[PDB]
Design an enzyme around this catalytic site. Structure first.
Site, PDB file in Angstrom:
ATOM      1  N   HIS B  62       0.801  -1.255   0.000  1.00 23.33           N
ATOM      2  CA  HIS B  62       0.000   0.000   0.000  1.00 23.33           C
ATOM      3  C   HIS B  62       0.810   1.270   0.000  1.00 23.33           C
ATOM      4  O   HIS B  62       0.384   2.330   0.488  1.00 23.33           O
ATOM      5  CB  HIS B  62      -0.996  -0.059   1.155  1.00 23.33           C
ATOM      6  CG  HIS B  62      -1.867  -1.247   1.043  1.00 23.33           C
ATOM      7  ND1 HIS B  62      -2.840  -1.315   0.113  1.00 23.33           N
ATOM      8  CD2 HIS B  62      -1.777  -2.514   1.620  1.00 23.33           C
ATOM      9  CE1 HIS B  62      -3.408  -2.554   0.163  1.00 23.33           C
ATOM     10  NE2 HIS B  62      -2.742  -3.286   1.060  1.00 23.33           N
ATOM     11  N   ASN B 135      -9.844  -3.119   3.142  1.00 29.28           N
ATOM     12  CA  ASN B 135      -9.624  -3.060   1.683  1.00 29.28           C
ATOM     13  C   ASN B 135     -10.952  -2.773   0.970  1.00 29.28           C
ATOM     14  O   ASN B 135     -12.027  -2.821   1.618  1.00 29.28           O
ATOM     15  CB  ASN B 135      -9.089  -4.400   1.153  1.00 29.28           C
ATOM     16  CG  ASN B 135      -7.593  -4.610   1.389  1.00 29.28           C
ATOM     17  OD1 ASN B 135      -6.806  -3.671   1.634  1.00 29.28           O
ATOM     18  ND2 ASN B 135      -7.187  -5.870   1.302  1.00 29.28           N
TER      19      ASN B 135
END
Ligand code: HEM
Ligand code: HEM
Ligand code: HEM
Ligand SMILES: [Ca+2]
Ligand SMILES: [Ca+2]
Ligand SMILES: [Ca+2]
Ligand SMILES: [Ca+2]
Ligand SMILES: [Ca+2]
Lengths: 319, 672, 674
Positions: B62, B135
């Site tokens: 990420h 997510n």
């Protein structure tokens, strides 16, 4: 491989910890088959700690880049101009490592951004490592190192939202260029096809700065480094570069890797322009000024030797 | 707020060092005007030292993302289901920070890569910071945290040459997926439109794991977090996402920034599914297994509160780059479960912040500080920003009168582990047999997509697998896809010149579930922020007039309108040279500009027509207001999502319905 | 002072670093006798913090202690320097000072023989200004590039890491004898200056020549000298050694206690000021850091008062984390071409990256300035600021050209003294003007009293006797002989070698004021000095005598400890924990005489050893009450001795005894070489 002594083979054998204890690494140790994971599971922690600490800071500039190993071969005994040992005999060979890069973008940004490009060469000589840390454009934006963070802050993304990636196409960059006119020369280069080379192999390398060659007798001459590509000069067109940035962010690194794998390792003639100390201000500009080239009509190139890249790294991170 | 105290204003004043001494920073100190730079130039060295050390390690995953501040507001007093303070009263407001991201790419990679996306939310509650680190896809690739580096190594670039960036389209990723079949459910989500969302605002957020809500009486229930977008669900098409990755790598962060700046801050309903502890295994799968969803048919969503993002950061690095989330940032009223993926995450986030921050005092960074007093005996460490008055930092003590006091279930609103929790059995490195069905739910998900959506998912697989060099990896992929759906395997195999294995029906079924389809989710509930490109010309004053009139009308409805012509001037926002169809959600050509669609040094050959043709091909509403144009483009006048009107007002009415429909899927071919 | 950053934990429930109330006493386990769980975030956050508490110690001056204070200017010094903190009579600036030994690690003893650090930060209204000095006015070496050579040689041998905090080993004396520049600092370190009585009883020196620069651009050369108001005092070696073991914290405790009792130490901050034309006028080069300007050549000018009066709240956050730099300079001050100073400018900025582990160390509370910061420095690990200016580059129009450049003519900028120039070849060559390594060491030696000279000789005898190499020992005698033949002979006698023949090239008879400790006369104040009263619980009249003595001594601000066999009301310390190193004078009450002429409560002969040690170490000693001969005879101390007191009258005893405390040391108790 020049770095064979440090290579680790994992083509056979059982998984071990870093201290040689054979282990597994696929299931966590739990209190019961549907239970919580145990603190005593050292297999889990050593594996995950290593993962957690894999990243290091990217380079402050030239973060996006690719490298290869090769060989430099001198064309002559250059004692007449330099004491440099790697240049002291015809056919003398020295291993090299070269890294090419864009300049403004972070890791992961596209190879085919419009930008200045890095061209950094290490010669592992028998008298020490010698690096020529160069670019694909022979002049730089600014005339004093103290201004580097101003230049780089202006070209890199705006610091409130970090937009845009790998691009001079925003207010702050053109503000800097317009307020700091020394930038004009490199700016014109970057806006030409030199800002979007067809590949690392189709671009030249320059030391940018005037350096000195020093003989063993203490006399010196002023030099500029020019790595002239044996593959020729070529560029993308801008619309093409934009599409490539989306379809293949890795275009230049893949092109280099592939050329080396197919036995077409790229070559450059390593050249210098060489002038006397007395010509420092003779050409209509100051040789101490990195925003200026010496026109080839004033000082021709001398070929010192051949640089050839012919071996890809084994581990990208490590090398 | 801990941030307001640390804001630094440089709108006036003279340059100083970091210790307040006024200085200059434009010329180096030299021994004569053409001489060498001096070592005693401390102005030079402090400035360049700071520059030299600006960078910090990117996040291990990420790494590419963008953040914004906002507020959460509770809809009720939720004491009946949780002791959580931020949920304890109707209208209780809590400040938040959210960061959204791709997952695989490095920090300079394109927003529009096909990927799982991160959606991490910090609630700065009056009982401590609480993070939900989630997510945009509700299921994860693997069933045990110890496998995380294997997954990530396989999807990240090959480690000899670091190719390819931000992409699963290579041998190692597909080798992993085909050898570790737990991956199939998340793989099918990533290969759907969920892998390429239209924006961060048009995706949902999921906590993935089952967690617990714990009441002050100590009883607990099992929950799943679902943040449901109030902007609706929307995706790009793959070819569009590819082009976007090159034309605008910052597309999602720009979209978020601009929506906030225009007063259109995005919103989600923060929801949970809540079920009893006795139902851990009642739904045909194990609630400890992070590769499974609870179908909404079995457990409906309860809306807990409103999440709104409405303020951009002041400094990206200090706020967005430096924010350090942890699932370990938990509050009283919430507890963990024995999901072996969740269990191991708890270790990883605390550890990895040492890497990013370079020191143990990262919770002292303003973005990480809580909004309540900190009382504990943690001391020293590099970067220690506190001056602790208590000179007896040990428990038990009398020398500081026994303070701080221990907090627990009974005293001081302490966190406490749900007291109903137990463990029993051998100490084992064994996977529960209850985790073994890797294929039924991926098929459930596939069945729940519309025909064209299924085709898009097959085409994403055809694209990526066709790029895998190993014939053996490609066969192994077909083996696993075939266990989910024979038809999928057949259709993928067709594009790569292999035969699909024979049908193996062990996990096949025809069940569907609501709320997972994007195409099936109906028109967008708002078209505010959507982008309209009006293609015009400076050659005709009529063209510029039509564009201006169309503009004022669309802008009132909150549409972001760009007028494109050959060159800039009053009324024209963008040149054809910089314009692309990926810049727009709909494209309108004004009548007066008909002639451009039939060469110029001001833009690439055929650019005006290509913008219109790409927009059509990618399913966007397109129109002519005022055709030679629809014919040049091969666009059928009778097509859905194709508009032709003289009346500006009627045009706007029709076109605005088309923006809400968003994509016209009848323009995409299906398999026979 | 740093109030904005203080955290109070005098009340409240335990929380995590993110404000969640937690507990921290028992781990979470799978069952009551079960294994600990990975999900226990309470455990991991607390242990992770603990695991990461330590930071690298300073590369030198690792062992030290600090306090807050105030500097007050005595005048408007505008006529010699543009420096804002010196621009008005009575102008006050907050300070923080850290004192240290130099070679030892953290936790080594305060009373090692060593150079001492004396670093001062002025938090001025024009930026932080640091003077990073030592208690010795000259340094060992003439070029910064040699610092690792010096420090490697002085620090423990790197195979076994022995010995701690000491020059008494082969490598150090090998370096000293091969690098003769070291002689001057060596002689200082071998004198009582190497073993100061406290941080409050030593001076501070900038060592280097610096420049004062006026707003008009004119400059003068200066040396900084912080002159102690407490007076100068040393330990004797054989006391310093015992004290290293009995109380490794002696100096930091002395400083802490003085501040807490309202006796905060003071220095006059002084300069010698000389013209630029005098750089080579005094028979040496002002660029050479191995040389002092004799006070007979340039007298001290008092600029202001430095007083330390506030102890830190948290040692780590304040004293451990303070990061001094000579590059923290302000308008009105400039550097000189001293090659030792020149390289220091690089070292301090670099080394703080090692200690802090990131580039934002100036943001630590103790390092922050007290005025606003306006610059385009950004990001970096540990970045605490949230910068509003989104165009951090110069030149810009998008932030209207701010921040503006500061210089001589605008915004009170620092500027280099504009009369400074350079001329010549680019060279790695030593100036021949640096070549006299021996005359000043001899000037120093000549300036000490006879007993002081003996102590210096004895320090050298002690250390060199522990050097194993016969070749190194001979080389050391060669160098010492160039400073003084008599020194070489006297040292040689201890180590069974012949001194070489006199070489008078550098011998001379000149002397200079202000360098002797013994010669600096009685202490100007006796407040804080420590009096141990030896008494007994066996006689209620001994305790009565002790109590009367205490009242009369505490009146004059002496720190009094009553010592007896066991603790009770009025007794501070037992014999078991008492030692002569704990006192500046020792008194025995005659009621306790019997203890002086066996117990499970203290080691055999302890009460007498305290008295004998104190006598032998030169301290004022005595018996109060009238019956003194039993004690004095047992101790073999002559009743007629200077610094030996015997009175029946408490008032008369104290009056005499206080004169002895100001004399401080009775130097007639130490033997001299004939
Ligand atoms: C003639 C102008 C310059 C050229 C041609 C040049 C070239 C380069 C190249 C090619 C690299 C990457 C080397 C690699 O591949 O690892 C690099 C990195 C770097 N450059 Fe320079 N550069 C120039 C000016 C400067 C200036 C003026 C500064 C600062 C004062 C500077 C600071 C850096 C830093 C901090 C890095 C990252 C280095 C690392 O992490 O190893 N550059 N530059
Ligand atoms: C349910 C599956 C998972 C989800 C939804 C998830 C979500 C995320 C998100 C959203 C971020 C970025 C937070 C931010 O924006 O700063 C993140 C970072 C991270 N994750 Fe997880 N993750 C999951 C599984 C794991 C596992 C099993 C591990 C390791 C065992 C892990 C290790 C990390 C690490 C090392 C980072 C970077 C953290 C940092 O530098 O602050 N992830 N993850
Ligand atoms: C005139 C000679 C010198 C004097 C009076 C001097 C004084 C000091 C003092 C007092 C400290 C400790 C400051 C504190 O309490 O934190 C110190 C630390 C230090 N010194 Fe110097 N020093 C001198 C020469 C040098 C030289 C020539 C170098 C290297 C070129 C150097 C490198 C250092 C380093 C690396 C530290 C640790 C600094 C830190 O961690 O903040 N010293 N010195
Ligand atoms: Ca900008
Ligand atoms: Ca691969
Ligand atoms: Ca879709
Ligand atoms: Ca040794
Ligand atoms: Ca570090």
């Amino acid at each position: 491989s020049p770095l064979a002594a440090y290579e680790v083979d994992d083509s056979t054998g059982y998984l071990t910890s870093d201290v040689g204890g054979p282990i597994q690494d696929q299931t966590s140790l739990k209190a019961g088959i549907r239970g919580p994971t145990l603190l005593e599971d050292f297999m889990f922690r050593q594996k995950i700690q290593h993962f957690d600490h894999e990243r290091v800071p990217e380079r402050a500039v030239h973060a996006r880049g690719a490298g290869a190993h090769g060989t430099f071969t001198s064309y002559a005994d250059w004692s007449n101009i330099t004491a440099a040992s790697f240049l002291n005999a015809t056919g003398k060979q020295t291993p090299v490592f070269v890294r090419f890069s864009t300049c403004a973008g972070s890791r992961g940004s596209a190879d085919t951004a419009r930008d200045v490009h890095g061209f950094a060469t290490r010669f592992y000589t028998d008298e020490g490592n010698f690096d020529i840390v160069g670019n694909n454009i022979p002049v730089f934006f600014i005339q004093d190192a103290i201004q580097f963070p101003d230049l780089i802050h202006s070209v890199k993304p705006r610091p409130d939202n970090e937009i845009p990636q790998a691009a001079t196409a925003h207010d702050s960059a053109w503000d800097f260029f317009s307020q700091q006119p020394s930038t004009m020369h490199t700016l014109f280069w970057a806006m030409s096809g030199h800002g979007i080379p067809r590949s690392y192999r189709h671009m030249d390398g320059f030391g940018v700065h005037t350096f000195r060659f020093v003989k063993d007798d203490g006399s010196s001459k002023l030099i500029k480094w020019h790595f002239k590509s044996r593959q020729g000069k070529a560029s993308l067109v801008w619309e093409e570069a934009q599409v490539l940035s989306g379809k293949n962010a890795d275009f230049h690194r893949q092109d280099l890797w592939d050329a080396i794998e197919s036995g077409n390792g790229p070559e450059w003639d390593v050249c210098v322009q060489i002038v006397d100390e007395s010509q420092a201000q003779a050409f209509g500009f100051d040789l101490l000024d990195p925003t200026k080239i010496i026109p080839e009509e004033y000082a021709p190139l001398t070929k010192l030797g051949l640089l050839k890249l012919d071996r890809n790294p084994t581990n990208y991170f490590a090398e | 707020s801990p941030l307001a105290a640390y804001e630094v204003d440089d709108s006036t004043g003279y340059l100083t060092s970091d210790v307040g001494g006024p200085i200059q920073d434009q010329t180096s100190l030299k021994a004569g005007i053409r001489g060498p730079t001096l070592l005693e130039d401390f102005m030079f060295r402090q400035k360049i030292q700071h520059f030299d050390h600006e960078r910090v390690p990117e996040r291990a995953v990420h790494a590419r993302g963008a953040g914004a501040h906002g507020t959460f507001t509770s809809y009720a007093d939720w004491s009946n289901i949780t002791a959580a303070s931020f949920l304890n009263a109707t209208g209780k407001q809590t400040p938040v920070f959210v960061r959204f991201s791709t997952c695989a790419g490095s920090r300079g990679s394109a927003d529009t890569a096909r990927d799982v996306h991160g959606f991490a939310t910090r609630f700065y509650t009056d009982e401590g910071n609480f993070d939900i680190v989630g997510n945009n896809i509700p299921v994860f690739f693997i069933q045990d945290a110890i496998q995380f580096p294997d997954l990530i190594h396989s999807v990240k670039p090959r480690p000899d040459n670091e190719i390819p960036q931000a992409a699963t389209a290579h041998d190692s990723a597909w080798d992993f997926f085909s050898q570790q079949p737990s991956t199939m459910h998340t793989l099918f989500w990533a290969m759907s439109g969920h892998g390429i969302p239209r924006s961060y605002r048009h995706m949902d957020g999921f906590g993935v794991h089952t967690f617990r809500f714990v009441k002050d009486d100590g009883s607990s229930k099992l929950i799943k977090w679902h943040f449901k977008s109030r902007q609706g669900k929307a995706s790009l098409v793959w070819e569009e996402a590819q082009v976007l990755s090159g034309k605008n790598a910052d597309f999602h962060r720009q979209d978020l920034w601009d929506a906030i700046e225009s007063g259109n801050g995005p919103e989600w309903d923060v929801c949970v599914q809540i079920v009893d502890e006795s139902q851990a295994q009642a739904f045909g799968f194990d609630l400890l297994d992070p590769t499974k969803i609870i179908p909404e048919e079995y457990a409906p969503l309860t809306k807990l509160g409103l999440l709104k993002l409405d303020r951009n950061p002041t400094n990206y690095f200090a706020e967005t780059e430096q924010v350090m989330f942890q699932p370990g940032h938990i509050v009283r009223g919430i507890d963990f479960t024995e999901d072996p993926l969740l269990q191991g995450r708890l270790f990883s986030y605390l550890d990895t912040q040492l890497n990013r921050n370079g020191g143990p005092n990262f919770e002292q960074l303003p973005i990480n500080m809580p909004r309540v007093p900190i009382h504990n005996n943690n001391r020293d460490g590099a970067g220690q920003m506190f001056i602790h008055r208590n000179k007896y930092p040990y428990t038990p003590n009398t020398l500081n009168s026994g303070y701080p006091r221990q907090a627990n279930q009974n005293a001081g609103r302490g966190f406490f582990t749900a007291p109903g929790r137990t463990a029993s059995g051998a100490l084992v490195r064994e996977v529960s047999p209850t985790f073994n069905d890797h294929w039924s739910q991926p098929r459930l998900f596939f069945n729940s997509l519309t025909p064209v959506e299924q085709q898009f998912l097959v085409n994403a697989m055809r694209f990526e697998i066709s790029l895998v060099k190993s014939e053996e990896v490609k066969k192994n992929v077909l083996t696993q896809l075939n266990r989910v759906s024979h038809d999928v395997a057949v259709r993928v195999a067709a594009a790569i010149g292999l035969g699909a294995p024979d049908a193996d029906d062990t996990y096949y079924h025809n069940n569907k579930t609501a709320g997972v389809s994007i195409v099936g989710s109906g028109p967008l509930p708002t078209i505010k922020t959507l982008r309209v490109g009006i293609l015009a010309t400076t050659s005709e004053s009529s063209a510029l007039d039509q564009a201006a009139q169309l503009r004022t009308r669309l802008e009132k409805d909150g549409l972001v309108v760009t007028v494109v012509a050959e060159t800039l001037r009053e009324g024209v926002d963008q040149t054809y040279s910089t314009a692309d169809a990926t810049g727009f959600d709909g494209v309108v050509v004004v009548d007066g500009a008909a002639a451009l669609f039939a060469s110029s040094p001001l833009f690439p050959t055929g650019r005006p027509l290509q913008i219109f043709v790409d927009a059509y091909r990618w399913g966007k509403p397109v129109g002519v207001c005022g055709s030679e144009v629809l014919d040049a483009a091969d666009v059928p006048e009778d097509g859905d999502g194709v508009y032709s009107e003289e009346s500006v007002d009627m045009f706007v009415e029709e076109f605005e319905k088309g923006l809400a429909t968003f994509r016209f899927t009848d323009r995409f071919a299906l398999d026979s």
